[PDB]
Amino acid sequence: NEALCKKDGGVCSCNNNKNSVDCSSKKLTAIPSNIPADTKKLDLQSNKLSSLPSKAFHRLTKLRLLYLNDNKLQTLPAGIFKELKNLETLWVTDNKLQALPIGVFDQLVNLAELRLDRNQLKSLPPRVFDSLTKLTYLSLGYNELQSLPKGVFDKLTSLKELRLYNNQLKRVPEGAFDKLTELKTLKLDNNQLKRVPEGAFDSLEKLKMLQLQENPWDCTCNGIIYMAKWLKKKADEGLGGVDTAGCEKGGKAVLEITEKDAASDCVSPN
């Protein structure tokens, strides 16, 4: 029998009137097992959790915020979050996650913010984000992603910010952002993109910040023309970031490129 709250002898600090349990930074190796099912905010960030028992949050029906960032999770049991139907924010950043269970987010219908940066993600399940209707903030930065599953975003029609920076993206899918009509910030800097497919940004009206730096854009062949025409047409409208896309070789900004220097339908570095 171990008391949860410091006031009762435990190590985690607890705010009764606010229904919050703060077990953050107590060198923990296991989820305390006597967390009131009444809890709205659970903080387990900055501890040493290498695994995580399923059904660990399956009584916590009222959970609104769950911070699992900065532990040692290498995996997530298939149904850890199937009961958190009122969760609004989930952070599982800074861990060693190497994959995400196919329907791990199927029950999070009220989710608004989801961070998964700095993990070991190599691929995403085809429909992992399909239930995140109300989702407005998505960051997947700092992982080992090389490509994205076609349609992975289609259901996210309220997304405001999307961060795919700091991965190893070789190419963005066909119509990956077509349904993100309400997107205002798109971060894609630091990947291995040579260009984006034609029309890749046509739905992003209402877009305010675009981060494209640190990518090997080859303005040495058409295929970059769509992105140049678009960016240039967006520079005027006061986009922001339009200048961050820079040529791999040319030195000059993709923005400036015309069909003159990129008039040759040929294939990026082989």
The two beta strands, 20-22 and 13-15, are: antiparallel
User: For residues 224 and 94, what is the distance between their CA atoms, to the nearest angstrom?
Assistant: 34
User: For residues 60 and 214, what is the distance between their CA atoms, to the nearest angstrom?
Assistant: 42
Q: Which residues contact 181 (CB under 8 A, 6 or more apart)?
A: 157, 203, 204, 205, 206
- Locate 209 and state its tokens: 């910040």
Measured at the alpha carbon of residue 49, what is the angle toward residues 44 and 50, in degrees to the nearest 5? 155
CB 138 within 8 A of CB 156: yes
Other CB atoms closer than 10 Å to residue 257's CB: what's the count? Answer: 24
User: For residues 228 and 258, what is the distance between their CA atoms, to the nearest angstrom?
Assistant: 7
Nearest-Å Rg of the Cα atoms of the chain is: 21
What three-state secondary structure class fits 144? coil
Which amino acid appears at position 263 of this protein?
A: A
The two beta strands, 161-163 and 137-139, are: parallel
Q: Which residues contact 82 (CB under 8 A, 6 or more apart)?
A: 58, 106, 107
Query: For the domain with range 1-270, which CATH number is right: 3.90.230.10, 3.40.50.2000, 2.60.40.10, 3.80.10.10?
Result: 3.80.10.10
User: For residues 253 and 267, what is the distance between their CA atoms, to the nearest angstrom?
Assistant: 20
For the chain, how many residues are written?
270
CB 212 within 8 A of CB 188: yes
What three-state secondary structure class fits 229? helix
Measured in degrees and rounded to the nearest 5, phi and psi for residue 233 equal -70, -25
CB 67 within 8 A of CB 24: yes
Other CB atoms closer than 10 Å to residue 174's CB: what's the count? Answer: 12
Technique behind the model:
X-ray
> Which of 209, 196, 188, 98 has its CA nearest to residue 141?
188
